[PDB]
């Protein structure tokens, strides 16, 4: 129970921290006029399709 | 019979190797299809 | 400058069609055929990438299309409505030159030639945004803005 609850919270820890990255990743474009982003960065990030 | 029965569409041969050369050869054309088809849809996502 | 060269589908206000280089070019989502049965008896092909339609001009009235280039710069533009704007990275017009039926319609630059084709647009009064397809280099794109539909 106590390592269900540890490994659960790491993989919980995960996204956390790859929500944490993305957002800093991801704002910049996001905050700048003219639908900015590149091709290979929409794909890793996941933002759906395209720059739009 | 003094022997148990056999798994008749399992338990086939060594040398029903042809399985496999044919299996390798058609299940590859399909995988090389769908990489084929994965790149140029990749392609065609960079031309939206 | 009425330099330009068309045809519309089913002989009503169906959308158009245009002559650009050497192939016929039309809309995917216009209904009915070509009004012109020289055009109208060819072999189409179609994309659902770029609402759109083509094949290769007969040879006795390939003389006769239109000139096309790739370059958009920023300023004014001709088209059958008039008004025709590009500007921000977008195509423009105001509200009363563009609605439904005037699809297919080619904008030509300064100099007489074919930049883009209207497909439809989303509304606004001094500046409608337009829905478009264009060449880029040598290789054909679709624009689009937010929030546009097709004529």
């Given at each position: ?52 | ?30 995988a090389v299809a769908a990489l084929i088809l994965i790149?140029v849809l990749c392609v065609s996502f960079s031309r939206? | ?56 001009i007969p040879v006795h009235m390939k003389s006769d ?87």
């Amino acid at each position: 129970s106590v390592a269900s609850f540890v490994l659960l919270s790491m993989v919980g820890v995960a996204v956390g921290m790859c929500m944490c990255a993305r957002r800093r990743c991801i704002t910049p474009y996001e905050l700048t006029p003219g639908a900015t982003v590149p091709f290979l960065l929409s794909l890793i990030c996941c933002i759906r399709t395209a720059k739009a | 019979a003094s022997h148990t029965t056999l798994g008749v569409q399992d338990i086939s041969v060594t040398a029903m190797s042809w399985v496999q050369k044919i299996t390798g050869g058609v299940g590859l054309v399909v995988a090389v299809a769908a990489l084929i088809l994965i790149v140029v849809l990749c392609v065609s996502f960079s031309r939206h | 400058n009425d330099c330009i060269f068309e045809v519309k589908h089913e002989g009503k206000v169906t959308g158009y069609a245009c002559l650009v280089g050497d192939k016929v070019m039309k809309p995917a989502h216009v209904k009915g055929t070509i009004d012109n049965a020289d055009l109208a008896k060819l072999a189409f092909k179609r994309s659902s990438k770029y609402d759109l339609e083509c094949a290769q001009i007969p040879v006795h009235m390939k003389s006769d299309a239109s000139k096309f280039t790739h370059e958009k710069p920023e300023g004014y533009y001709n088209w059958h409505h008039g008004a025709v704007q590009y500007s921000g990275g977008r195509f423009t017009i105001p509200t009363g030159a563009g609605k439904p039926g005037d699809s297919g319609r080619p904008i030509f630059d300064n100099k007489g030639r074919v930049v883009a084709i209207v497909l439809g647009g989303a509304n606004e009064g001094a500046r409608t945004a337009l829905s478009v397809v264009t060449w880029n280099k040598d290789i054909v794109t679709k624009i689009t803005p937010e929030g546009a539909e097709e004529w």
